């Protein structure tokens, strides 16, 4: 019964109770918010190619 | 209106200042899972409030019912107050 003197909690249970959640990358914030502020740029810049100022306040010619 | 929703996605607290591993291991596991789900939820809300190329096809859903209300058989500008006032004139005249 030498196995009952060993710690009963496995190494697998340590690795799954210690590294439980996949950690959040530091670049995820930059990638996601830059992909969304690209749409903020494209809609609302006055120098963006597909700007939404002429669809919203149309013109007066 | 999307500006009004964007302005309250602008006052959201920075969860990225709590991603470090000194905040990982001090926290209860289910609370950290809830925190990472809350960060993913904010990225969902911010990715959809800045889809401004959807507002045109949203405005095209308000146009047909309104434009069918203005194809009235009486008048384009008729409403309930003028029609009730004209029923007041019509009914209180000599038949």
Q: What does the alpha-carbon distance between residue B84 and residue A53 come to, in Å, rounded to a whole number?
A: 41
Those residues whose C-beta lies under 8 Å from the C-beta of residue A23, and which sit 6 or more positions away, are B19, B21, B24
Contacts with B21 from chain A: Cβ below 8 Å: 23
Instruction: Supply A52's token pair.
Output: 């939404």
Q: How far apart are CA B86 and CA B80, in angstroms?
A: 10
What does the alpha-carbon distance between residue B50 and residue B46 come to, in Å, rounded to a whole number? 6
Contact assessment for residue B51 and residue A39, using Cβ atoms and an 8 Å cutoff? yes
* Alpha-carbon radius of gyration of chain A: 27
Name residues whose C-beta falls within 8 Å of residue B6's C-beta, 6 or more positions apart in sequence: B49, B50
How much of chain A is in helix, strand and coil states, percent to nearest 5? 45, 0, 55
Distance from the B30 Cα atom to the nearest Cα atom in chain A, whole angstroms:
9
Q: Is A7 on the interface with B (CB under 8 A)?
A: no
Candidates B42, B69, B48; CA nearest to A24 is B42
CB atoms within 10 A of CB B83: 13
């Amino acid at each position: 019964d030498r196995v009952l003197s060993l710690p009963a909690v496995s190494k697998n249970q340590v690795l799954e109770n210690v590294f439980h959640t996949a950690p959040k990358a530091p670049v995820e914030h930059l990638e996601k918010m830059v992909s969304a502020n690209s749409k903020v740029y494209d809609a609302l810049n006055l120098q963006s190619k597909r700007v939404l100022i002429w669809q919203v306040k149309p013109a007066l010619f | 209106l999307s500006n009004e929703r964007y302005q309250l996605l602008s006052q959201w607290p920075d969860f990225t200042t709590m991603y470090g591993k000194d905040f990982y291991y001090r926290a209860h596991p289910e609370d950290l899972k809830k925190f990472y789900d809350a960060a993913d939820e904010y990225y969902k809300l911010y990715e959809t409030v800045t889809e401004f190329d959807s507002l045109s096809a949203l405005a095209s859903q308000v146009v047909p019912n309104y434009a069918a209300r203005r194809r009235s058989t009486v008048h384009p500008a008729i409403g309930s107050t003028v029609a009730d006032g004209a029923f007041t004139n019509f009914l209180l005249s000599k038949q």
